[PDB]
């Protein structure tokens, strides 16, 4: 290539504007660049990972730096209940005086924004107390950023370039990551909790300059090597302990108490320390499984190759999977993203119900922000997992080398899989929509008693088995004579059962028919999105309408108007369609979470319980109500600190609709229009003197789909974020 993009002369020889766009859009798809090899691929990916790490460290250091420099962290640690955490100061020369006055919150001497990332609760819980601590941490993470960049640059150099064989050493990387990255890190974090966090919560200032001079335990290190570990759990913090103070503080460092610290309404630091320690041990033991350079250990290839059931109901089983995974980075990225997405949702679900940060969960807006954040992140990550799924199926999958294994057999009965997903989605849709519409009609005709309200018996039963006594099923942990109850009666069950039956927190909230309905909506969402994604993955290589689709790649416009028409036939297009359904699904889940929790914090769950049974209830009592303050951020009379969220609300609506533009109108119209504009320019005097170097053309079909989807998603996210934050913080529950 003689011009941008240098990695593709095909695009470089494009005389049009496309050349630029695609240049930007294919910059990270290394596999499709000119003169690339496996080596360059892995090496560039490695360096790119270092770059990403550097960006993360720099980002975190930025957060720490700004909280320390412009925030009220100290004022917050002195009074976490009645201080709004400052994210950063704001200097906008576009501001008028009312704007300056309105945005001066907290103890600030000027306009600021209130943090809803919850970094205050986190940092305070783990041991940070002063601005100086934050500054030192910022400097350290900046140092880590520089180090990571240096490492990328280094390993890019010919002396430090790793071979492809090294990248394909799976057993070693698994051993090291399980034992070191997972194990040693968790053990070391337990170390931080024991040495810094726990003493900090007990009112003991422990830093680098004295941590060697202070005992983490009255009789430290003895009981560990003695085997008298129980001594580390002797006297935990009292039930009247005040966080950050010596009052009510114990001396234990490792416990399994369960439940929440009553003041902070979060998990016990000793519980978390013991947790991280234990899992550190499971990781460390589990990290010595695979064979390396010492003559012992397992061979993953052999393990896979051995797991084939006699009788052949799974064909050749897992024979050959080792190579087809270890050779295909896309398969690896698919597995990675799938797992990561699952545990991201897990993070949301566990962090809302079992908060681990002191004086979070009292901060309602922060909780909502966090849940929505992680659920949308999880959604996108999932769609991506299912996107690198079929890229594997197209770019990497070798049919012959996978003969009759679980994967090839998977492609065999694809119609069965897809058709059954279709049935599930169809059923759930028909009946959930049907029941909702039924109930709405009943409410309309003034007869809500005729509503079909199905009780969530199964989930309620699970809650009862977990020790909740609201439904009175009296099972397992709810049954006084149950062996499961007697087993841990004197360990975690006191605190746990105390927490699960305290109906002011989010630990196993009480559920009714509304919960049933919306849960089935969620089921519909999951099943349908997976229908799109799975169907797109399995038909990525071909279908009866296009048997040679694999010869065209992951992304292409279409195959033409022939054979009936082939719009949106590529696997990429399947992804693109699936994104709408993910946004819809997560929309429903976040709507659910937020409404239920707002009604919880407001003190009237009956609102949700009665109104969520019909869609007019969601529209009127959730959407329409909670926008009152939001839309009044600015008006003909004046403005307040919510003007940002109103402006952002409208911003989101606008971007969303522009998305509609790119999604509804297609290329040819615009191409011809642009032709008339080109004529116009070449025939306009004075302007004639100026000419373009890249011929103006309409965006491509796929490009249009992408840009449209991007406007749509951005609008979606920004709109809901503005509503979430404004509605919640406008009243703070």
């Amino acid at each position: 290539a003689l011009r941008f993009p240098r990695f593709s002369q095909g695009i470089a020889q494009d005389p049009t504007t496309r050349r630029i766009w695609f240049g930007i859009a294919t910059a990270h798809d290394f596999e499709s660049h000119d003169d690339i090899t496996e080596g360059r691929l892995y090496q560039n990916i490695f360096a790119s990972h270092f770059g990403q790490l550097a960006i993360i460290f720099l980002w975190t250091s930025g957060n720490l730096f700004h909280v320390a420099w412009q925030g009220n962290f100290e004022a917050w640690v002195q009074d976490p209940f009645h201080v709004r955490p400052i994210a950063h100061a704001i200097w906008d020369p576009h501001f008028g005086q009312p704007a300056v006055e309105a945005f001066t919150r907290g103890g600030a001497l000027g306009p600021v924004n209130n943090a809803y990332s919850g970094v205050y609760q986190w940092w305070y819980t783990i041991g940070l107390r002063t601005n100086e601590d934050l500054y030192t941490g910022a400097i350290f993470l900046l140092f880590l950023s520089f180090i990571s960049l240096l490492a990328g640059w280094l390993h890019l150099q010919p002396k430090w370039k790793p071979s492809v064989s090294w990248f394909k050493n799976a057993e070693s990387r698994l051993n090291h990551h399980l034992s070191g990255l997972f194990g040693v890190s968790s053990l070391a974090w337990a170390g931080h909790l024991v040495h810094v966090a726990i003493p900090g919560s007990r009112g003991e200032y422990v830093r680098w300059n004295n941590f060697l001079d202070v005992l983490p335990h009255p009789q430290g290190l003895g009981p560990l090597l003695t085997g008298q570990w129980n001594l580390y759990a002797q006297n935990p913090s009292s039930s009247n302990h005040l966080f950050g103070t010596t009052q009510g503080a114990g001396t234990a460092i490792l416990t399994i108490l369960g439940g929440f610290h009553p003041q902070t309404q979060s998990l016990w630091l000793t519980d978390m320390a013991h947790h991280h320690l234990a899992i550190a041990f499971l990781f460390l033991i589990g990290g010595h499984m695979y064979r390396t350079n010492f003559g012992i250990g397992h061979s993953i290839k052999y393990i896979l190759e051995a797991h084939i059931p006699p009788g052949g109901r799974l064909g050749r089983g897992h024979k050959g999977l080792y190579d087809t995974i270890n050779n295909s980075i896309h398969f690896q990225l698919g597995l990675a993203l799938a797992s990561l997405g699952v545990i991201t949702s897990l993070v949301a679900q566990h962090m809302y119900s079992l908060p681990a940060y002191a004086f979070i969960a009292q901060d309602f807006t922060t909780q909502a922000a966090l849940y929505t954040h992680h659920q949308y992140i999880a959604g996108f990550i999932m769609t991506g997992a299912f996107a690198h799924g079929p890229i594997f199926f197209i770019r990497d999958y070798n049919p012959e080398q996978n003969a009759d294994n679980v994967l090839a057999r998977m492609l065999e009965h694809k119609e069965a899989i897809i058709s059954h997903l279709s049935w599930a989605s169809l059923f759930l849709g028909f009946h959930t929509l049907g029941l909702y519409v039924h109930n709405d009609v009943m409410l309309a005709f003034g007869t809500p008693e005729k509503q079909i309200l199905i009780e969530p018996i199964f989930a309620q039963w699970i809650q009862s088995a977990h020790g909740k006594t609201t439904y009175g099923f009296d099972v397992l942990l709810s049954s006084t004579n149950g062996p499961a109850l007697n087993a841990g009666r004197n360990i975690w069950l006191p605190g746990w059962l105390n927490a699960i039956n305290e109906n002011s927190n989010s630990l196993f909230l009480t559920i009714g028919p509304g919960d049933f309905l919306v849960h089935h909506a969620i089921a519909l969402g999951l099943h349908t999105t997976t229908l799109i994604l799975v169907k797109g993955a399995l038909d990525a290589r071909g279908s009866k309408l296009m048997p040679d689709k694999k010869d065209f790649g992951y992304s292409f416009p279409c195959d033409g108007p022939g054979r009936g028409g082939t719009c949106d036939i590529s696997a990429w297009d399947a992804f693109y369609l699936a994104v709408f359904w993910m946004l819809n699904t997560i929309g429903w889940v976040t709507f659910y979470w937020h409404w239920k929790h707002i009604t919880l914090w407001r003190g009237n769950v009956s609102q949700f319980n009665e109104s969520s049974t019909y869609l007019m209830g969601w529209l009127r009592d959730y959407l329409w109500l909670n926008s009152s303050q939001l839309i009044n951020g600015y008006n003909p009379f004046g403005m307040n600190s919510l003007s940002v969220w109103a402006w952002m609300f409208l911003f989101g609506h606008l971007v969303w609709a522009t998305g509609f533009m790119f999604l509804i109108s297609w290329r040819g119209y615009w191409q011809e229009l642009i032709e008339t504009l080109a004529w116009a320019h070449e025939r306009t005097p004075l302007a004639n003197l100026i000419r373009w170097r890249d011929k103006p053309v309409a965006l491509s079909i796929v490009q249009a789909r992408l840009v449209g989807l991007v406007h749509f998603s951005v609008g979606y996210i920004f709109t809901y974020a503005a509503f979430l934050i404004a509605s919640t913080s406008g009243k703070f529950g």
């Binding site: 050493n169 008298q228 129980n230 390396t292 360990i491």
Partner: protein
């Protein structure tokens, strides 16, 4: 109260004995059946220079070939069992 030294030494002794006498052949056999490789050739033949099996360290003048690695392995199991027993008998758990 249980003597930590006696429990640990006896446990480690039992594990090392079990690995030296009763489970040695089986282990050596299963290891003989397995060895990590990518695309047919091993990791070192591929080849990653840092994936070569240590011949020197695995050498032993023991009658059966019981080397330092087996000592570390069965020893690890021994210490694990030992500290399990110690920590367990230390607590006041009652079901």
């Amino acid at each position: 109260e249980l003597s930590p030294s006696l429990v640990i030494s006896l446990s480690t002794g039992l594990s090392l004995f079990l690995g030296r006498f009763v489970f040695f052949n089986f282990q050596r056999e299963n290891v003989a059946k397995q060895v990590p490789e990518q695309n047919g050739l091993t990791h070192f033949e591929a080849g990653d220079t840092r994936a070569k099996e240590y011949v020197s360290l695995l050498k032993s003048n023991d009658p059966v070939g019981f080397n330092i690695v087996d000592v570390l392995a069965w020893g690890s199991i021994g210490h694990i069992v030992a500290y399990y027993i110690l920590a367990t008998t230390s607590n006041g758990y009652d079901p």
